[PDB]
Design a protein around this ligand. Structure first.
Ligand SMILES: C#Cc1csc2c(=O)n(CC)c(NC3CCCC3)nc12
Ligand SMILES: [Mg+2]
Ligand SMILES: [Zn+2]
Length: 318
């Protein structure tokens, strides 16, 4: 049954209401490997790039296993969710009609690896505790640079692309980095303003790689914060997990006199209030610009869920 139903759910991997939680329970925690493998084969990538399936499984397992499963939110199930969303966005017509197999490959790798080896605490925390990552990356997109360099390390170690030219391997590394770095939420204003100006001007040319990669970066940013655009029953699980992780960082800050970060204080802060502010100020602006770019049923469905989920959180107030 368990392998039966898993295989079965993957028939609906293009669906916005895909249930990654059930999927991960069904696979005893193998959701990122098993979904991503399926997508490589669905998008034809194993053939297009002459991939060794043994090396691909090894690669995917190294990724999945380098997530910290004890993180309430930043674990391989979140990676798998982001990868599944990225897949839905790659199916939108303006992307499906311009992306090459190389773009699809880099998008799905970047989605799978984008929070790799995440410690479960944020950049301000690592900076104020003098963590070696904050030094190494000079206080700038500390976590994203760490996920990216960790991804590069796994790419090199797996040999998966060893039969491609060195210059293609290097280019793969660099374009994945630009995708992962776009997920630094502290810089969403720079990405969103540039994207919005391109949409005002109407100047995007998707047959140009640079414009297409700007859009893929915005797609990955959507994938990363699309939790509130899911159905209530998914979004509520994501909200409890993210809050659980923030609040744990809060307890450490409190216990050790570090200063409690915004959003991490379980005594003065609420799950509903945290979601509401986030939806108003980060989610709705990004998804409104996304819907201008890709003005489709999926974009409407996603914005409908934000409005409904936001009303549910208000409802659970007074
Ligand atoms: C600031 C803030 C947030 C308040 S609620 C909330 C949330 O539910 N998520 C999950 C979508 C993220 N994702 C962020 C974490 C860092 C990158 C994306 N950020 C926040
Ligand atoms: Mg991240
Ligand atoms: Zn993420």
């Amino acid at each position: 049954d368990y392998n039966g139903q898993a295989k079965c759910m993957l028939e609906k991997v293009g669906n916005w209401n895909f249930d990654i939680f059930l999927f991960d329970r069904l696979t005893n925690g193998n959701s990122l490997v098993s979904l991503t493998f399926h997508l490589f084969s669905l998008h034809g990538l194993i053939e297009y790039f002459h991939l060794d399936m043994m090396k691909l499984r090894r690669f995917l397992v190294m990724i999945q296993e380098d997530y910290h499963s004890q993180n309430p939110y930043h674990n391989a199930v979140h990676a798998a969710d982001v990868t599944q969303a990225m897949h839905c966005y790659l199916k939108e017509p303006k992307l499906a009609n311009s992306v090459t197999p190389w773009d699809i490959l880099l998008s799905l790798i970047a989605a799978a690896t984008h929070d790799l080896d995440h410690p479960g605490v944020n950049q301000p925390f690592l900076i104020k505790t003098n963590h070696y990552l904050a030094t190494l990356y000079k206080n700038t997109s500390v976590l994203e640079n760490h996920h990216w360099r960790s991804a590069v390390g796994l790419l090199r170690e797996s040999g998966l692309f060893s039969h491609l030219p060195l210059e293609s391997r290097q280019q793969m590394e660099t374009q994945i980095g630009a995708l992962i770095l776009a997920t630094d939420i502290s810089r969403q204003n720079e990405y969103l303003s540039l994207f919005r100006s391109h949409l005002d001007r109407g100047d995007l040319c998707l047959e140009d790689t640079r414009h297409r990669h700007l859009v893929l970066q915005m797609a990955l940013k959507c994938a990363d914060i699309c939790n509130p655009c899911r159905t209530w029953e998914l979004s509520k699980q994501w909200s409890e997990k993210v809050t659980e992780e923030f609040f744990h960082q809060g307890d450490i800050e409190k216990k050790y006199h570090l200063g409690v970060s915004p959003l991490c204080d379980r005594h003065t802060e609420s799950i509903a209030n945290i979601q509401i502010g986030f939806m108003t100020y980060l989610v709705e602006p990004l998804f409104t610009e996304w819907a201008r770019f890709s003005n489709t049923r999926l974009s409407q469905t996603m914005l409908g869920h934000v409005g409904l989920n936001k009303a549910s959180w208000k409802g659970l107030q007074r």
